[PDB]
Each structure stands twice: as C-alpha cells, then as structure tokens.
Amino acid sequence: ETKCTLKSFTVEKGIYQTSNFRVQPTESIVRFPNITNLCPFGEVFNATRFASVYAWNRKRISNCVADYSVLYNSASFSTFKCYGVSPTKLNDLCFTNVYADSFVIRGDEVRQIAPGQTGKIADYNYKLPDDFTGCVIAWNSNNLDSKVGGNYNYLYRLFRKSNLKPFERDISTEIYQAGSTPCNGVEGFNCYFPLQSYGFQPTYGVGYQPYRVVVLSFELLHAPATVCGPKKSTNLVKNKCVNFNFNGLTGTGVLTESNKKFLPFQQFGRDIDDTTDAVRDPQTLEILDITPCSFGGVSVITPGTNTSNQVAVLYQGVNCTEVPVGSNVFQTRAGCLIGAEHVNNSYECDIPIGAGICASYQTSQSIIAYTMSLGAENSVAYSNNSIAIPINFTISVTTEILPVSMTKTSV
Amino acid sequence: PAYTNSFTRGVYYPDKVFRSSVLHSTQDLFLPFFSNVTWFHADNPVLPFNDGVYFASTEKSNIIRGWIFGTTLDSKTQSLLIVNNATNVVIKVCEFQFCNDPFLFRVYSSANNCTFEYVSKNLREFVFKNIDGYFKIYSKHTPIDLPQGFSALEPLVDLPIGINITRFQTLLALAYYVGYLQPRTFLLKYNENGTITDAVDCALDPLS
Amino acid sequence: DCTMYICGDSTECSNLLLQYGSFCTQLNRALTGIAVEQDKNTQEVFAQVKQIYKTPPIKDFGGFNFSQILPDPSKPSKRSFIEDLLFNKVTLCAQKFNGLTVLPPLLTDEMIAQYTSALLAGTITSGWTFGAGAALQIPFAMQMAYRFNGIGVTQNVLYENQKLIANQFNSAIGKIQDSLSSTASALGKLQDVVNQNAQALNTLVKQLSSNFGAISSVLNDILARLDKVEAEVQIDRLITGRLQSLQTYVTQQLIRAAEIRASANLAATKMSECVLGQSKRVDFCGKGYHLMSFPQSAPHGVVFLHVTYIPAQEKNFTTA
Amino acid sequence: LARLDKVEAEVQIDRLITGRLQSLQTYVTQQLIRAAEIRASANLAATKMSECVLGQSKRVDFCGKGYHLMSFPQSAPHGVVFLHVTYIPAQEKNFTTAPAICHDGKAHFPREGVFVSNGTHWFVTQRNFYEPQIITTHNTFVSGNCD
Amino acid sequence: DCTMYICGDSTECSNLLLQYGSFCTQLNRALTGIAVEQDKNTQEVFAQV
Ligand SMILES: *[C@@H]1O[C@H](CO[C@@H]2O[C@@H](C)[C@@H](O)[C@@H](O)[C@@H]2O)[C@@H](O[C@@H]2O[C@H](CO)[C@@H](O)[C@H](O)[C@H]2NC(C)=O)[C@H](O)[C@H]1NC(C)=O
Ligand SMILES: *[C@@H]1O[C@H](CO)[C@@H](O[C@@H]2O[C@H](CO)[C@@H](O)[C@H](O)[C@H]2NC(C)=O)[C@H](O)[C@H]1NC(C)=O
Ligand SMILES: *[C@@H]1O[C@H](CO)[C@@H](O[C@@H]2O[C@H](CO)[C@@H](O)[C@H](O)[C@H]2NC(C)=O)[C@H](O)[C@H]1NC(C)=O
Ligand SMILES: *[C@@H]1O[C@H](CO)[C@@H](O[C@@H]2O[C@H](CO)[C@@H](O)[C@H](O)[C@H]2NC(C)=O)[C@H](O)[C@H]1NC(C)=O
Ligand SMILES: *[C@@H]1O[C@H](CO)[C@@H](O[C@@H]2O[C@H](CO)[C@@H](O)[C@H](O)[C@H]2NC(C)=O)[C@H](O)[C@H]1NC(C)=O
Ligand SMILES: *[C@@H]1O[C@H](CO)[C@@H](O[C@@H]2O[C@H](CO)[C@@H](O)[C@H](O)[C@H]2NC(C)=O)[C@H](O)[C@H]1NC(C)=O
Ligand SMILES: *[C@@H]1O[C@H](CO)[C@@H](O[C@@H]2O[C@H](CO)[C@@H](O)[C@H](O)[C@H]2NC(C)=O)[C@H](O)[C@H]1NC(C)=O
Ligand SMILES: *[C@@H]1O[C@H](CO)[C@@H](O[C@@H]2O[C@H](CO)[C@@H](O)[C@H](O)[C@H]2NC(C)=O)[C@H](O)[C@H]1NC(C)=O
Ligand SMILES: *[C@@H]1O[C@H](CO)[C@@H](O)[C@H](O)[C@H]1NC(C)=O
Ligand SMILES: *[C@@H]1O[C@H](CO)[C@@H](O)[C@H](O)[C@H]1NC(C)=O
Ligand SMILES: *[C@@H]1O[C@H](CO)[C@@H](O)[C@H](O)[C@H]1NC(C)=O
Ligand SMILES: *[C@@H]1O[C@H](CO)[C@@H](O)[C@H](O)[C@H]1NC(C)=O
Ligand SMILES: *[C@@H]1O[C@H](CO)[C@@H](O)[C@H](O)[C@H]1NC(C)=O
Ligand SMILES: [Zn+2]
C-alpha cells in the first residue's frame, strides 16, 4: 500500500499515511412509527366529480401509512412527474404531512402544471412554487368529463388583475376591466366575466380533451412524521456500529442510550455545529445518542525497503479494541500501534510517531517502539569557587546548506 | 387602551430540536425586545392579528378563557374557536356566526361547515402563529403590569389548518396584554439542560 | 480527511469526487507538511541543548534566587512555577463526523519542560560556555561579573554591589510572577494563534451546513430522496462547494504556518543569541543592556525572561 | 470537439475549463507561498554571507557551533553551502577561583581574564584558554578595600 | 464589501449568496486582519521611542 500510494517500488525510511480506517456497520436498523392506518388515496383519485381548476380542491393526508407503489405501478396514469423527489425512492421516504390537490384541465394545459411555469392556468388557476417537493399525476378523462353537445361542468379563470401566489386560490366572479372604460358590474367593451368553460365534446383532439390531475405535495420538515412508506420497522440494538433510518433520518453511527433531557415536543437533538447528534425512537420514545463510528488515518511505519520489508501500522487516534488485527499491539497516545515491539529503553528519535514515541529497526531485527531520549544527563559540578578552563582547543568546520532559489517556471 | 413595555418577554422555542450549551442564531417571527405592547383590563374588543400575536394575562381568578380567530368573524368564512372550558381545552374550526359580544355558553348564534376539532398570582403567556398552513400555539405559566424578566414559551399545540386569519377577539367568563410578532434574528442561549436561558434581539441596538 | 469532509459515508459521492482527481491528495499532503513542520519548529527552538544539564542540589548562586524559574519536583509535569502559571493562563482520538482530527505533537509538554530546564540549568551553572560546547562550570556571581564587562561596566561594580544586584533580580522575578498571575492580555500573542486556528476550524465545519445550491445541505437526504441521475446533479453542487471550502482552509493554514515558521525561527534565534550567549544587539533581548535570558515554556510558545541593566539616577557633569 | 456540436460541446468544455482553471490557480497559489519560503531562506543566506563570510560574527550559533572564526562560501544547485570555521574549547580542567585578590588591604580585580589557583599558587589567565600568568599590578586593577 | 462586490444593490442576488454561507464573512475577516496588521507594522517601526 505504501509503494502504491507513493507510486514507487522503493520506499525510504519513514512514516507514510496510506489510507483511512473506518469501523464498518454491523447491520441496518429501520424505525418508523407503528401506524397501521392506510392512507386514503382512493377518495382523491376516484372521486366522481373533480373540482374546477379555478377552485382546485385540497385534502390533507396524514397519520397514515402510504404505499406509493400502488400508484406508480399502475399503467393508467398518462403522466407521473416528480420534483425534488424520485418516484421509486418515494416509497422509502417519510413525510410530516401531505396535501393532495385535484382538478380537471385540457390536455394542452398539463405542461403548465410544473414549477416555474406561466400561462393562464399557471398564473391564474394553480401556481406551483419554485422549490416544489411533490409529484404531478395526470390522466385522460375523455371517457368521463365529456359528453355529446359538450360538458360545461368545469371552469377556469380566463382573466385576473395579477398572477396567483403558489398554492393560492381565487373563486371571485367580479367582471374584469381590460381598459379605461368602467364596467360598473356589467360586461361590454373591455369588460369580461373572469371565468370560462371548456369545450369538452368527446370528438375533440387530445390537446382539447379533458384530463384529470392529482398533485401531491409533501411536507418534508423537522416536525414529527405522520405519513411513512410501507417499510417494516426492525428491532433496535445499541452500542454496535449500525446503519439507521429513523422516520427518514438516515445515517451510520453508534446508537447509545442518552441522558439528554429532551422536552416532550422535541424529536431530534443537534451538535454544537448543527449536525444531528441525538434522536427519539418513534416507538419506545427513548432518546439515543448518535456517536460516529470511529475513523482514523492509517500510517505505515517502515525502514527503507533496501533495509527490510517488515513494517508496522499506526491507526491514528484509534483505540486497540476497535482495530481488526505482525501481531504485537501497543496503545500509544498517538493511536493503536501494531506490528511494532514496545521496549523500555530510550534512544534518539529515529522515526517519529508522536506524543514522545518513536520507532526504529533494531535487535533478530524488529521494529521497536520507545519513548525518545532528549539527550545524555549531565550534572555540571557547580560550586561557589570552582571554574573550568579549556587546556586545549578544537578547530571545527561545519557545513550549513541553505536554499537560495527554485526552478524558474512558467505555465 | 393602556400601554406598557414588554421588556425581554415573548421568546419561544423556534424548533422541535434539542440543543444544549450552545448559542444559536435563529431568524423567525419574534416579539421585539422592549416592544410597546397594548394593555387591557377585565375589555374584549376585536384586535388585528397581523403576522402573529403575543398574548399574556396577569390573573388571580381565571376570567380569560378563550379566543376566536378569522377575517370576517362570522359564518361567511371559516373561523377558529379556542375555549378552555371547566374540564377540557377545546379547539374547533367552523363557519361560526359569532355573537357581537362573546362570553361564557354564548359565543356564537350558529355554526356550520366544521372541518377540524381537538380536545385536551398567575402570569400566563401565549404566542399564536399562522404560517405555512399551520396554526401554532406556544405557552408558559409563571408565578407572580407585565413583569421584567426572561423565560421561554414551549409549544403547546399546533393545528394543520389552512385557514386565513387577519383579526381576533378574546372570550371571557362572567388584565391582559397584546403584542405583535415581527421577523427578527434572535441569538438564543441554551443551557446544559437544553432550555433557553437568555436571548439577544440582534436588531435592537448596536451592542446587540 | 478530505474524502470524509466532502462525502462522509457516501460511496456515491466518493465516486463523483474521483472526477476531480488529485485535489484530495493535494489537500492531505499540504496539511501533512504543515503538521510535520510544527515538530520542526519546536525542535529548532528547544532541542538546541546537547545534554540534559541538571542543577546542583545546593543552590549557592551568589544570592540570586531562581526558585520561580527552576523546576518544581512536586509538579507532575515537573514544570517551573512560572511555567505552571503560563500553562494555566492560556485557555482554549476522533469522534467528529466531518473527518477532522488533531494530531499530538512529537515532544510532549513534559519533554519541552525538560529541555527548558536543561537550557536554564546550563545557563546558570556554566554561562555561555554550554552553547560553545564544553559547559565549563563557573560561579554565578563571576559569570554575572562577565556579563557586566560585556555591557561595558567594570566587573568590580558587580562584586561591590552584589547584594543589591541580587536583591534587584529577586524582586524583578517576583514582579513577573505577580504580573503573569494578575494579567490576562500578556499571553494574547499565544492566545491569538489558538483563536485563529479555532476560528478557522469552526468556519470549515459550519460550511457543511451550506446548500451551495443543492436541494439540501445534508448529503444523505439527497441520496435518500433522489435517484442516481438526479442525485448526482445535486451532489456535484455540494462537492464543488465543499471542495472550495476546504481549499480555502488549507490555503489560509499554509499562510498561517509561514507566520508561525517565522516566529519559530525568531524564537530559535533568541534562544541561541539571548540564552546561550549575551547579545550586543540593541532591543533584541529586551530593553536596556542585555545581561542574560532565561527560557520558559508555554503552550505552543516560549517565554524569554530577559535580564537587563538599566541606567538610573543620571547626574550632570561637565566634560572635556 | 470531435464528437459534440458547438451548443453541446461548450457545455462540456465549460466543465473542463472550470476544473483546469481551478487546478492551475491551486498551483500558482502554492508556488507563491513556496516562493516566500525561498525568499526568507535567501535573505538568511544573504545575511550569513555578509555577517559570517565578509566578517566575524559575535552572534551565538549564527555561524556554526563554537566561537566563530571565519566562513567559506561554496555554491550548490539552487543553494549555498557555508563552511563555518569555529574554535571549540577542549580538555577543560578544574581550577579554584576567586573574584578578587586582597593585597595590603586593596582589592585587586583582573583587567581581562580570571584568577585561578593551581592548588597552592594563584595566577591570572584568559577565560577561553588556560595560559596562566603571575598576578601583577599591571594585569589587575584596584577598586576599594577587601571588606 | 463582499456582498456589494458580488451582488451590488440586488436583494435577489444577496439571497442566493447566502447559499454559499460563510464565504463573505471569511473574506471580510481576512481583509480586516491585513488592515489591522498595517497599523501594527507602523507602530513596531516608529513607536519605539
Ligand atoms: C571537576 O571536579 C569534580 C569533582 O570535584 C573533585 O573535588 C574537587 C575538590 C577538585 O579536586 C576537583 O578537581 C575534583 O575532581 C568532577 O565532578 C564529578 O565527576 C565525576 C565523573 O568524572 C562524577 O561521577 C561526579 O558525580 C562529579 N561530581 C559532581 C559534584 O558533579 C568534575 O567532573 C571535574 N571536572 C573536570 C573538567 O575535571
Ligand atoms: C479503549 O477502549 C476500551 C473500551 O473498549 C477501554 O477499556 C475500558 O477502560 C476503563 C478504564 O478507563 C475500564 O473501566 C473498562 O472496564 C474498560 N472496558 C473494557 C471492555 O475493557 C480502554 O480504556 C480504552 N483505552 C484508551 C487508551 O482509551
Ligand atoms: C591539543 O590537541 C591536539 C589534538 O587536536 C593534540 O595533538 C596531538 O598530540 C599527540 C601527542 O600528545 C600526538 O600524538 C597527536 O598526533 C597530536 N595530534 C595532532 C592532530 O596534532 C595536542 O597534544 C593537544 N595539546 C595539549 C597541550 O593537550
Ligand atoms: C384573507 O382574506 C381577506 C379577506 O377577508 C383578504 O383580504 C383582502 O385582500 C385583497 C388583496 O388580496 C385586498 O384587495 C382586500 O381589500 C382585502 N380585504 C380585506 C377586508 O382586508 C386576504 O388577502 C386573505 N389572505 C390570504 C393569504 O388569502
Ligand atoms: C368541555 O368540553 C368537552 C368536549 O371537548 C366535554 O366533554 C364531553 O362531555 C360529554 C358529557 O357532557 C361526553 O358525553 C363527551 O364524550 C365528552 N367529550 C370528550 C371529548 O371528552 C366536557 O363535558 C366539557 N365540560 C364542561 C364543563 O362543559
Ligand atoms: C357550506 O359550504 C358550502 C360550500 O362549500 C355551501 O354550499 C353552497 O351553498 C350555496 C347556497 O347557499 C349554493 O349556491 C352553492 O352552489 C353551494 N356550493 C356547493 C359546492 O355545494 C353551503 O351552503 C354551506 N353550508 C352552510 C350551512 O353554510
Ligand atoms: C527563593 O524564592 C522563594 C520564592 O519563590 C522563597 O520561598 C519562600 O520562602 C519563604 C520563607 O523565607 C516562605 O514563607 C514562602 O512560603 C516561600 N515561598 C514559596 C513559594 O516556597 C525562598 O525562600 C527563596 N530562597 C532564598 C534562599 O532566598
Ligand atoms: C603551582 O604553581 C607553582 C608555580 O607558581 C609550582 O611551583 C613550581 O614547581 C616546580 C616543580 O614542579 C619547581 O621546579 C618550581 O621551582 C616551582 N616554582 C615555585 C615558584 O615554587 C607548583 O609545582 C604548582 N603546583 C601544582 C600542584 O601544580
Ligand atoms: C380506484 O379504483 C380502482 C378500481 O376501480 C382501484 O384499482 C384503484 O386502486 C383506486 N385508486 C386508488 C388510488 O387506489
Ligand atoms: C408502538 O409500540 C410501542 C412498543 O414498542 C407501544 O408501547 C406503543 O403503544 C405503540 N404505539 C401505539 C400508538 O400504540
Ligand atoms: C542498497 O543498500 C546497499 C547496501 O546494503 C547499497 O550498496 C546500495 O547502494 C543501496 N541501494 C539503494 C538504491 O539505496
Ligand atoms: C517495562 O516497564 C514497565 C513499567 O513502566 C514494566 O511494568 C514492564 O514490566 C517493563 N517491561 C520490561 C520488558 O522490562
Ligand atoms: C406606545 O404606543 C402608543 C401608540 O400606539 C403611544 O401613544 C404610546 O405613547 C407608546 N408608549 C410608549 C411608552 O412608548
Ligand atoms: Zn598599562
């Protein structure tokens, strides 16, 4: 691994960080609320009479267990777009609350039911937000919403003073004024009734045919969940490193019993730096600390390859109870040191490891690890009347090497 | 009506997330520090709701019992009725034809098209918010004019109702203060027990 | 850990990060150079002494009292009294999801305290001669008399006023002890380095909360909510922003490391020129004419107690 | 460019441009930092040339260990090597010493050097080399009485 | 002024800039350290007397 990370077949004496250690999770935990009540999608999709798009209906779906596969697996839907959510993962995800909206529109108007759209329907009938989190489901209804001589049950707003806000509704029938001529509450030049009815004859082209639409809006929030997918909740285990999924809160960690005094309304707890740090189990209501599964740089300690192929491994900051492991083990303050042999002697620091520990290849040779010596101890023999004077002298020549320049380069 | 200084009253837990031994800057509708709140004596006049309301009562006989919220405050629109009866807190949403002078039962002449219901010396503080299709209530009871001091209101209940509110009125059984929330950045201090013990209204003054 | 700061536990993100190539190798390599250099900086300042010189048990230093600066055997770290004050006055394994880890220094605080004790013991028992190499013992009052010659005062001034000079020195050390106990801003030069590094890490960690245009700042949300083709578009925004955030941190740490490197070279120069010798350089070793200096270790720093001769009670004379 | 038309190629090229530009900025930034390290080492080498080669330096450990005598510069690839020549005391010997000599009530101090006793006879000698001399009225100075 | 260099008078741009988080605080803080240091540099040279 050192040879590979250095991209060299030979390695000089030293300590080289080659990779990173990580305690992999033992198993996966899933914990959703123990709600058996199936969500009532049937009454929004199979209603006899839908709402006029100018007066689009809304229904809250909550405190129930959903199964969006029943919807998405059906072949009858002509369009099943989703924004900020994927139709497959939608069944694994969980939400606080959901709003189901429904109305009838022309086939040519389905393209307006998307975030950021404009036009008569988008601007004056049903406006989606810029950051819409839901799914738009639509199907042709020329078998139900049209008849010979035309069906005029449905209406849409043709004129308005200003564009609607997202999810805003306006059922007013005040005659719109398109010019300086006052209308005084009656139609005429520049004076038109704000609503109009579709020409739903059954012989019309697909763009003119009626289409039923259901829009599902998902409230992803920090608030407690009430609409989860059909996933079966697993048993709960502690102190093991495990994957977890609490009401959608997904991660990996060491679930530990928490002494943190969560108030009865609180569902999650957070780190000083706003990361999720504790959670309430949705069934037992116990509070669990989420400690991260331990990690650390893996440093390989080696003499030069021209000296020996034997090496030691330092798991930086890792405790020796956590590592999986050529079998000497020594808990330095720098981390768990493996493959090096601890000795009580002290020597000059050959290879530095940290916290006063160094390593060297020494005798039967092995990689020893020792507390480094600062130097030889020496009592100066000081006294109030003794002086030492050199009888002789040594003329010494010392090389000092200093960098002065570097290779002039241009790109 | 009279007027009084709110001091540091009206802080509440902005989110249902436990935080402890940390200072967290949050931006939400809060009652500004030292705000000039309206004062009434028991008075049951109709008042605007604006962006949100802070309501507090100093009492010794539990005379104040509920509130009504809406726009027309009549059967032409849905309205929210909150009433603390002698045995249960009761909450209802209906097109209530509220009386000209509601009191405790003579709150409305008739009701129809109901769509939501829920049933559960003293300074009582309450905060009412109506944002993103939720009506949210926070409250605290404190043993004791509005006293200067600091305590945080915990969430009492919230209603997933989409109704429109612009004005409200108080229901009495045969003194209180009203303040209005504003979008303010508050630096909140959480102790080791995870309760808010101090706050700084960042827009109040240069030191803040 | 560049790959853990940017992607955490996600293999999906880790594979996208490979498209940026060498950036995580460069970041880890740059931080490693900074870390290795911190041990060099400490070795260059403190490991100047060849041998661990020990003070005599009988401290007959001509009346000069070094008890506040020599090691206290009762302390577990064997620090001096002033060194213990310095360590107490500066006030600030891996269990962080963000991959941040703090490496221990090579020399422990106990080893650094052992080097300063050797430097100090050598200075008082042998003067400047331990720097040149032989560590020739000399009575303290006599080496102080040579310090006087070095500042251009005749050596008889030391012996004739030795009691006064010793009393003045002992009192001045007492004032330092009282000062470091009572003051706060004196160590602000070391505390600033701690505050700068802490603030830089809090900045780096808080940047994980930013969206950088993604639907969510939490990368596990995107993978739990969007399929591969859509998730990768959102993750690429987090990767780009987090990578830029980490590059900004590493760049500014390289600049700070160069500031500390300069301060360490300076501290190493003062050790050699002020502690191992007597310096003729004006204001290099405190105000006044330099006599000697005593090194004291501090958290991530060194304190030099510069002893100097300051003229006083000047009187007018006619001259020719 | 060989595989995509302008409208699609420009979208793909803008990614390479953004990444390559950031890659080159990272190199230039770190070279500026390294250049500052070399600049400091060059200023130091220039200081040692002036103070160690063109002079004799009293600065301890500036020009090698021991007392500096002289230095010789030698060029190296992108660097300079200083051969620092220094005097190092050797074979130190213990002597009894005194700060002053009392004579006829006068206190005598060494002009330069230190008083040392071979065990029976007092001598004055230079501090850095044992060369003992008779204590005389010339190599010592008087100041005050012996008390 | 990091927010004015990047966005000028635009509130629409200013809200987008918030998505990048701390970068404008870091830039202003770095330049402030440089500016404060210029007074230190002058004091260190001239205020010696
Ligand atoms: C200097 O001498 C001391 C010992 O003092 C001795 O007694 C004196 C009265 C005088 O006669 C000296 O010259 C004598 O040598 C030496 O210190 C001892 O050294 C040995 C090792 O050689 C060691 O085991 C002892 O512990 C030392 N004692 C102390 C108190 O440290 C010292 O080495 C002599 N120095 C030189 C340069 O010769
Ligand atoms: C490494 O981790 C283990 C736990 O896995 C620690 O062992 C515990 O140590 C405490 C004393 O500190 C004992 O009371 C426990 O009984 C030990 N537990 C076990 C299972 O042995 C160990 O101390 C850690 N080592 C370091 C250096 O932190
Ligand atoms: C001073 O030191 C030198 C060594 O640097 C000594 O010279 C040696 O002396 C011995 C005889 O005692 C000879 O055998 C060696 O060949 C000499 N070496 C050299 C390099 O000349 C010298 O004796 C010492 N002088 C004193 C007075 O101790
Ligand atoms: C809630 O209902 C009230 C009506 O009771 C709305 O108030 C009107 O708003 C329009 C602008 O949209 C004004 O032109 C009218 O003058 C307002 N009427 C009154 C009596 O104030 C209010 O807009 C509605 N709020 C929402 C969010 O739909
Ligand atoms: C307060 O209101 C609650 C309703 O919210 C009343 O409770 C009902 O009381 C009747 C008997 O009078 C029972 O048949 C119902 O089952 C109760 N409903 C619930 C939900 O508990 C209560 O009686 C009222 N109290 C007073 C004093 O009027
Ligand atoms: C309850 O609300 C509905 C509207 O949702 C009212 O129904 C309307 O009643 C008027 C007559 O008053 C009719 O002209 C409308 O056609 C009705 N609309 C619908 C959709 O049916 C109903 O009257 C309300 N009931 C009460 C008691 O107020
Ligand atoms: C050296 O200095 C220390 C102070 O740092 C002196 O210790 C004090 O001595 C007095 C008695 O003279 C005690 O009452 C104090 O409690 C001591 N203080 C400490 C901190 O120990 C010591 O006496 C001085 N020694 C000499 C020879 O002057
Ligand atoms: C101390 O120094 C004196 C000189 O001042 C030495 O005395 C001489 O010793 C030699 C024999 O070694 C005689 O030949 C001389 O005549 C002596 N001179 C005088 C003036 O007496 C003495 O030997 C030295 N002692 C030691 C122990 O070195
Ligand atoms: C609507 O009814 C059909 C049967 O007529 C049923 O298969 C379908 O599931 C119903 N819709 C929903 C959303 O369940
Ligand atoms: C869910 O399960 C727990 C047991 O783990 C049980 O105590 C609780 O009552 C269940 N939920 C409901 C709503 O009953
Ligand atoms: C390897 O070591 C041998 C001595 O054992 C030496 O002769 C040889 O030059 C070395 N080669 C390299 C590439 O270091
Ligand atoms: C090393 O020293 C420790 C005490 O620090 C002792 O417990 C241990 O037995 C010693 N081991 C050897 C091999 O001497
Ligand atoms: C509070 O506001 C009213 C106006 O609504 C004003 O008349 C009154 O003087 C104010 N009181 C204080 C103390 O500011
Ligand atoms: Zn003369």
mmCIF file of N, CA, C and O and ligand atoms in Angstrom, chain A residues 39-46 70-71 74 77, ligand 9:
data_model
loop_
_atom_site.group_PDB
_atom_site.id
_atom_site.type_symbol
_atom_site.label_atom_id
_atom_site.label_comp_id
_atom_site.label_asym_id
_atom_site.label_seq_id
_atom_site.Cartn_x
_atom_site.Cartn_y
_atom_site.Cartn_z
ATOM 1 N N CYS A 39 -53.298 5.120 4.164
ATOM 2 C CA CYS A 39 -53.625 6.450 3.644
ATOM 3 C C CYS A 39 -54.736 6.388 2.598
ATOM 4 O O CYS A 39 -54.674 5.558 1.684
ATOM 5 N N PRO A 40 -55.755 7.254 2.686
ATOM 6 C CA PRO A 40 -56.932 7.234 1.788
ATOM 7 C C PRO A 40 -56.719 7.909 0.435
ATOM 8 O O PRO A 40 -57.315 8.941 0.111
ATOM 9 N N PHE A 41 -55.841 7.341 -0.393
ATOM 10 C CA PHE A 41 -55.652 7.873 -1.742
ATOM 11 C C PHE A 41 -56.862 7.620 -2.638
ATOM 12 O O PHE A 41 -57.141 8.418 -3.541
ATOM 13 N N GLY A 42 -57.569 6.513 -2.422
ATOM 14 C CA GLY A 42 -58.713 6.174 -3.260
ATOM 15 C C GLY A 42 -59.743 7.277 -3.425
ATOM 16 O O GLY A 42 -60.230 7.519 -4.532
ATOM 17 N N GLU A 43 -60.081 7.972 -2.339
ATOM 18 C CA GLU A 43 -61.103 9.012 -2.411
ATOM 19 C C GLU A 43 -60.651 10.300 -3.096
ATOM 20 O O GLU A 43 -61.498 11.163 -3.345
ATOM 21 N N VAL A 44 -59.365 10.468 -3.401
ATOM 22 C CA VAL A 44 -58.940 11.644 -4.158
ATOM 23 C C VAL A 44 -58.742 11.288 -5.628
ATOM 24 O O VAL A 44 -58.947 12.130 -6.511
ATOM 25 N N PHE A 45 -58.344 10.046 -5.907
ATOM 26 C CA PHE A 45 -58.154 9.618 -7.290
ATOM 27 C C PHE A 45 -59.444 9.158 -7.960
ATOM 28 O O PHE A 45 -59.604 9.349 -9.170
ATOM 29 N N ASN A 46 -60.368 8.557 -7.214
ATOM 30 C CA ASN A 46 -61.592 8.003 -7.781
ATOM 31 C C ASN A 46 -62.853 8.798 -7.438
ATOM 32 O O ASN A 46 -63.952 8.236 -7.400
ATOM 33 N N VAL A 70 -48.472 1.363 -5.233
ATOM 34 C CA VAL A 70 -49.803 1.088 -5.771
ATOM 35 C C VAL A 70 -50.141 2.089 -6.866
ATOM 36 O O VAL A 70 -50.732 1.740 -7.894
ATOM 37 N N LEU A 71 -49.753 3.346 -6.667
ATOM 38 C CA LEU A 71 -49.983 4.401 -7.645
ATOM 39 C C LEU A 71 -49.027 4.285 -8.829
ATOM 40 O O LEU A 71 -49.459 4.158 -9.978
ATOM 41 N N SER A 74 -49.302 1.408 -11.414
ATOM 42 C CA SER A 74 -50.448 1.382 -12.315
ATOM 43 C C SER A 74 -50.102 2.015 -13.660
ATOM 44 O O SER A 74 -49.420 3.041 -13.731
ATOM 45 N N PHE A 77 -51.972 5.966 -15.478
ATOM 46 C CA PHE A 77 -51.528 7.359 -15.443
ATOM 47 C C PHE A 77 -50.703 7.735 -16.671
ATOM 48 O O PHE A 77 -49.676 7.114 -16.963
HETATM 49 C C1 LIG F 9 -59.516 3.497 -7.873
HETATM 50 O O1 LIG F 9 -60.352 2.356 -8.119
HETATM 51 C C2 LIG F 9 -59.711 1.264 -8.791
HETATM 52 C C3 LIG F 9 -60.770 0.209 -9.015
HETATM 53 O O2 LIG F 9 -61.858 0.716 -9.777
HETATM 54 C C4 LIG F 9 -58.542 0.771 -7.945
HETATM 55 O O3 LIG F 9 -57.857 -0.260 -8.647
HETATM 56 C C5 LIG F 9 -57.586 1.912 -7.621
HETATM 57 O O4 LIG F 9 -56.574 1.441 -6.736
HETATM 58 C C6 LIG F 9 -58.332 3.090 -6.987
HETATM 59 N N1 LIG F 9 -57.428 4.213 -6.790
HETATM 60 C C7 LIG F 9 -56.512 4.262 -5.815
HETATM 61 C C8 LIG F 9 -55.666 5.498 -5.770
HETATM 62 O O5 LIG F 9 -56.373 3.349 -5.007
#
